[PDB]
């Protein structure tokens, strides 16, 4: 294991990027929300929907997001979109965890 030239194995650290999000519901727009995680040899991570798993090696039907972050853009906001964003990452020295939320109104 390795920093980038030198011999240190740091554990994981993720976060929730400012732990309350929210959204106008039923207009059918696009909006951004994240728990960015960092490690180093680099990290794995995955998070839920208040229980059932956003995996992004398979749950993707309105979502898709950038590496070296957890920037999950989700289309088309309607109602349905509120959640609690419970995130984990682990990585080759260790493991770490956080929670966003995320209050979608009807006007």
Known sequence: GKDIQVIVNVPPSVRARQSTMNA???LSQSVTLACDADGFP???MTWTKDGEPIE?????????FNYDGSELIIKKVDKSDEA???????????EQDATIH?????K
Do not use: M, W
């Not at 609690?84 to 260790?94: D, S």
């Open 56 to 64: 992004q090696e398979d749950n993707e039907e309105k979502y898709s």
């Open 24 to 26: 106008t519901a039923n």
């Open 42 to 44: 680099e990290p794995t």
């Open 84 to 94: 609690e964003y419970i995130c984990i990452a682990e990585n080759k020295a260790g």
């Open 102 to 106: 995320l209050k979608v109104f009807a």
